[PDB]
């Protein structure tokens, strides 16, 4: 996640193994109940796309669900590019596939900012909503 350090520079703090376990624990315990959504949000405060990918990648099994989530992300990335045919970030940059941590932090702190972690979080939550709907 992005944090303000004591200096207060805005910098990246490494994602915690505790956060990753907490995320997998909720997915496994609640079996993609609606409860997964607020938990995903609570665990991803300040997340960069790199952080979010590391979170999502720790979910094992649920291959079909994860594939659906990836397709939702791909669709949102393509829609971003349709509405932003110039400039940076690209949709793939928001999803962290073609961007670096430094690029992500730069966009998040730019003036004006492009909150790429929040945008990606929104896309992921849209994907999670479809999974939740499907598994209900
Ligand atoms: C190699 C592979 N095959 C998959 C099939 C389904 C889901 C994930 C994978 C992967 C790894 C995989 O692609 N994981 C994703 C993160 C991810 C995980 C789970 C769901 C959605 C996004 C990832 O690391 N990146 C860079 C990524 C992010 C957005 C779109 C495409 C790729």
Author numbering: 1 to 85, 96 to 146
Authors' text:
Capsid is the primary structural protein of HIV and a critical part of the viral replication cycle, both in the assembly of viral particles and in the infection of host cells. The capsid protein (CA) of HIV-1 plays critical roles in both late and early stages of the viral replication cycle and is widely viewed as an important unexploited therapeutic target.
To further understand the mode of action of this novel class of compounds, we determined the crystal structure of HIV-1 CA NTD protein in complex with PF-3450074 using a CA protein construct that contained a single glycine residue in place of the cyclophilin binding loop (residues 87–99). Although the cyclophilin binding loop is important for viral infection, it is not required for proper HIV CA protein folding and in vitro multimerization function. Using this construct, the co-crystal structure of PF-3450074 was solved with the NTD of HIV-1 CA to 1.8 Å resolution. The structure of the complex showed that the overall fold of the CA protein is the same as previously described CA structures and illustrates that neither the compound, PF-3450074, nor the loop deletion caused any significant shifts in the protein structure. PF-3450074 occupies a preformed pocket in the HIV-1 CA NTD bounded by helices 3, 4, 5 and 7. The indole substituent protrudes from the NTD R3 sub-pocket close to Lys70. In the model, the R3 indole group which protrudes from the NTD in our structure localizes to the interface between capsid monomers in an assembled capsid and sits directly between the NTD of one capsid monomer and the C-terminal domain of another, making contacts to Tyr-169, Leu-172, Arg-173, Gln-179, and Lys-182.
